[PDB]
Every structure is written in structure tokens, then in C-alpha cells.
Amino acid sequence: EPVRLAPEREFIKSLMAIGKRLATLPTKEQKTQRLISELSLLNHKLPARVWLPTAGFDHHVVRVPHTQAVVLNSKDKAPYLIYVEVLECENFDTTSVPARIPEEPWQEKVRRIREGSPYGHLPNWRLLSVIVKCGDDLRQELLAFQVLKQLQSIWEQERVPLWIKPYKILVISADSGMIEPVVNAVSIHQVKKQSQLSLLDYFLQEHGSYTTEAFLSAQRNFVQSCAGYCLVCYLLQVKDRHNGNILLDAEGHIIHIDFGFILSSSPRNLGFETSAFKLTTEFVDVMGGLDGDMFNYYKMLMLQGLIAARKHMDKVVQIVEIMQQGSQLPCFHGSSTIRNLKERFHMSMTEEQLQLLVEQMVDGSMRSITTKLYDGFQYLTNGIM
Ligand SMILES: [Mg+2]
């Protein structure tokens, strides 16, 4: 029995077909009801010789818990999120399809699904998640994912301890795809809404006090991820940054999501911004303030990260150029997109100049901080303060 492709195609198509039927429904409530029925049907055919390509390890799909999926918010479309139970195997080509067994945080979902699943006792059981978008073009997300992976590889190679979290994208059609969500994390919006704390106070409560290893560890993770995404947002010109599309994980890292406006995507910023990455007071406070060692570390990481990126520039630009040749995406706008991208690597600068640039960029990223208004008047008047 060779690895047959038709089962897999039918599986992927079934997920898209579900989305299409949900999209005929006006209300979220109705889509939720329909989704339960749809997933129950899917389970008729499982386990099967099919896989979720976003897994990143060989496995068979065994179950899609039909009550546990989520219809996501959409004005027009019908995006949805499913949890998918799989059994890991070492080699998919040699492994037989598993025999059927008859019938909040990530951590609680995993617990509840495992307990309710006839497969949940198996040691090779794993829960995966995927967002199915049957009417959204994900090629721009895929480009971002490819670039993020490349930057991650560059920083690893150059031993720069920046941290980012590329999330997997599958492009199905020109107007459909799949996204592996980042599950161990909540938007900063919700972290603040639920806790009613600043991020600093949240860290002190959740991780520990200033003298604790946990606090320092979380702070280090926050800085390394902040620096990583600062560079990502600058190089890719990621726009539409807000607390709804920045997540916080249980380790203190931030994760940027939703790359719907990158590179030359309209509308262009008219406020002379170097990047839409904004370093708020709240963020600077987590780093222990403007004069703090962790803020200095942040700036050092930005410089070492940019040095590393610059050194391997062609690896990143090539990814963008290949995507541009194949596709007519909104983030491309004729010649200038690539020119401007290359210029953001600062190939002509010395490391001394790059250090000065990082200072300017960091200063600019805090432009929304009220202190900058208060203490910026020397640039706007003939006074020296
Ligand atoms: Mg002046």
C-alpha cells in the first residue's frame, strides 16, 4: 500500500467544503450549530490514511471532537477553528492506519478533549489545532511565515538570542488556506481585560517579584521577543499593530499575528513612521524603564539582530522576490517594494552607524509615549528644551 494522495485531497477538501456551507448562514449561532453536524460527519470516515500537514511530524488523524470547534468572528466569511486528534507514528509509509476505537486555555482544552476521547489514553496521542479559511487568500501570510522562518534561522546561525514564533500557513486555493494558531497564548487585550493589571503588574503577579528567577526569566523572554518582532515589523513593514494582534505566552514572550498589511500594502502611513511597531510605556515598564539594563539589552539585541539580518540579506530578499514573481499580491507595488526592502538592511552602514540607527529607531518607536510630547519641543521651537 503506497501513500495514496486521494484520501488526503478529500480530507483537505472536506474542511474547505465545511467552510463553504457555514458561509451560507447569516449568524454565528447558526454556523456553530452547523459546524457540530459537519464535524460529526467527518468522524464517520476516521481514523483514515490522512494527515494534517501543519503537524510537522508523521501521524494519522483519528478524531475531530465535534463539540469542541469554534466559529471565528467574520463580517462576511466563515473562518473556523478545529481541534484534531492524531496518533504520532515514526514512519507514515510503513505504519498501518490505527484501528477505530468506538465512542479557556489550551491546557484545559487538551485535558477535556483527552478525557472525552476514546484515543486519549494512547501515549502517541497528540492534539493539534488548525484554522480553516475557505474564502481568504493566505499567500501574504505564507510569505510572512517564510520570511519569519528565515530570520529565525539567521539569528540561530549567528547566535543572536532573539525570539519569534512563525506560525504555519497552508495555501490551498488562491482564496483559501489553513493556519496553525499559536495556542499557548492570549492577546494582550484579553490579558489586560481579564487581569485588570498593567503588563508589569501582571508579570509580578503571574511570574514573581523582582528578586525571583521567574520574573527575570519572563522579562528576558519579553525583551528577546520584543526585539525579534521589532525587527520583523521593521523589515517587513508590518502594519495594523494593536493589542488584539499581539499575543502573550505563559513564558513571557510576545507573538505578533495577522500580517494582512505588509511591505507596500495600502494604506501608506502619512505620519513619517519608520515602523508601526510601537514601544508603549507599558512595554518599557516591563523592561524596567528607559534607563534599565533590560532595555539596554533590548537595544543590543536589535543591533545584533540587524547585523545578522544584513549579513544574510539575500536569503530573505529572495523569498520575497520569488513570491512576487508568482503572485499579484496587494503587498507588492512594482519595483519599489523590493528596492525599499533591501534598503532596510542598511548594507552601506558601518556597525557604528547601525548602532546610531537602532537608537533613532527605538526613539521613534516610543513617539506615542506622552513623555516624547512633553520633552520633544527642542525640535519644534528655537528653545533648547
Ligand atoms: Mg530648538
Side-chain angles (χ1 to χ4, degrees):
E1 291 167 343
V3 177
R4 293 304 181 192
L5 294 185
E8 183 67 2
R9 289 199 306 273
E10 288 312 310
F11 175 56
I12 299 298
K13 280 193 311 194
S14 291
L15 298 183
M16 290 307 170
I18 288 172
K20 288 298 179 181
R21 280 184 299 260
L22 296 190
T24 68
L25 291 169
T27 65
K28 181 162 158 177
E29 284 76 24
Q30 288 169 251
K31 295 174 197 272
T32 299
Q33 286 292 288
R34 184 91 289 279
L35 181 57
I36 296 161
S37 294
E38 290 285 356
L39 295 179
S40 191
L41 280 173
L42 205 61
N43 281 299
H44 291 193
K45 298 174 157 203
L46 297 173
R49 200 163 188 193
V50 301
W51 59 94
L52 210 68
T54 51
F57 60 81
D58 284 357
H59 66 280
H60 297 88
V61 174
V62 293
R63 188 167 180 259
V64 183
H66 65 287
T67 66
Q68 294 298 302
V70 180
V71 180
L72 299 179
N73 297 313
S74 181
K75 296 181 177 180
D76 294 5
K77 308 291 173 54
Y80 67 92
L81 189 151
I82 55 169
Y83 300 91
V84 179
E85 297 175 49
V86 308
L87 294 183
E88 177 166 8
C89 60
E90 205 169 2
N91 258 78
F92 183 96
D93 64 310
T94 62
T95 299
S96 313
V97 176
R100 178 176 289 169
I101 304 174
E103 300 285 324
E104 68 190 320
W106 171 248
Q107 278 290 15
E108 245 38 51
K109 197 69 147 181
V110 170
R111 178 189 75 67
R112 290 193 316 107
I113 288 169
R114 188 193 281 282
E115 168 164 355
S117 173
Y119 300 97
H121 64 287
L122 292 177
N124 62 321
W125 183 95
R126 292 185 68 173
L127 191 69
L128 298 177
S129 184
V130 70
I131 302 171
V132 178
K133 312 195 79 173
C134 69
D136 287 288
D137 183 351
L138 294 195
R139 286 175 293 173
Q140 199 166 292
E141 284 280 335
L142 174 61
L143 175 55
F145 170 55
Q146 291 164 344
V147 171
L148 265 61
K149 282 189 301 183
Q150 184 58 259
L151 285 175
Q152 183 176 63
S153 165
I154 284 162
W155 292 327
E156 174 185 59
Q157 185 180 2
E158 295 300 317
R159 300 204 289 231
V160 180
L162 291 172
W163 187 101
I164 58 171
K165 178 66 165 193
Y167 56 85
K168 293 180 184 171
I169 308 293
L170 292 181
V171 166
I172 300 309
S173 78
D175 60 348
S176 69
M178 280 160 62
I179 304 182
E180 186 179 53
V182 176
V183 297
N184 62 341
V186 178
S187 77
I188 281 161
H189 177 60
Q190 281 301 333
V191 171
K192 293 172 65 174
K193 194 200 189 73
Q194 288 176 51
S195 69
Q196 288 297 307
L197 296 173
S198 68
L199 283 179
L200 176 54
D201 282 341
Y202 183 78
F203 272 55
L204 289 168
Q205 181 198 262
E206 280 309 300
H207 295 290
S209 54
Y210 291 110
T211 67
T212 61
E213 185 282 340
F215 180 73
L216 288 181
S217 179
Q219 192 176 40
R220 188 190 190 189
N221 288 339
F222 184 79
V223 165
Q224 288 175 345
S225 64
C226 273
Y229 281 106
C230 180
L231 286 179
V232 163
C233 290
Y234 173 63
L235 292 175
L236 282 185
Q237 287 291 296
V238 183
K239 302 300 171 198
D240 191 24
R241 298 297 84 201
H242 60 75
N243 287 354
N245 51 15
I246 308 167
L247 312 184
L248 183 71
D249 79 12
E251 292 177 302
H253 304 112
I254 71 167
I255 308 96
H256 285 241
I257 64 168
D258 190 351
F259 298 108
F261 298 84
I262 68 166
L263 297 175
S264 302
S265 293
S266 298
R268 189 178 64 82
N269 174 255
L270 306 181
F272 204 77
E273 286 179 41
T274 292
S275 174
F277 191 81
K278 86 199 199 85
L279 208 54
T280 63
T281 290
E282 182 168 60
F283 275 39
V284 176
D285 282 348
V286 173
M287 294 185 204
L290 287 173
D291 198 11
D293 289 344
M294 290 298 281
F295 190 70
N296 287 347
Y297 181 49
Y298 171 80
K299 294 193 299 176
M300 285 177 218
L301 284 178
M302 276 181 69
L303 171 60
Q304 291 315 309
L306 186 53
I307 286 164
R310 187 171 79 155
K311 174 175 170 186
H312 296 279
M313 176 183 77
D314 284 286
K315 291 178 196 62
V316 174
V317 171
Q318 186 183 49
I319 291 162
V320 180
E321 282 186 306
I322 293 169
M323 183 64 75
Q324 180 180 55
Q325 285 174 57
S327 315
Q328 190 179 358
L329 301 181
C331 59
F332 296 121
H333 277 257
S335 290
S336 205
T337 301
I338 299 292
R339 176 179 171 81
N340 289 8
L341 168 61
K342 289 176 172 181
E343 290 187 305
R344 286 193 296 279
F345 288 82
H346 304 281
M347 283 300 311
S348 56
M349 276 194 188
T350 68
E351 295 195 356
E352 189 181 8
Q353 292 161 0
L354 273 185
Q355 182 172 55
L356 288 175
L357 173 74
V358 168
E359 290 288 341
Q360 178 193 359
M361 288 192 308
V362 167
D363 192 289
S365 73
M366 287 183 306
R367 57 188 278 160
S368 58
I369 292 180
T370 53
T371 309
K372 289 291 168 187
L373 175 59
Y374 201 86
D375 292 305
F377 278 99
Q378 84 205 72
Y379 295 106
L380 304 173
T381 71
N382 288 323
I384 66 166
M385 47 193 330

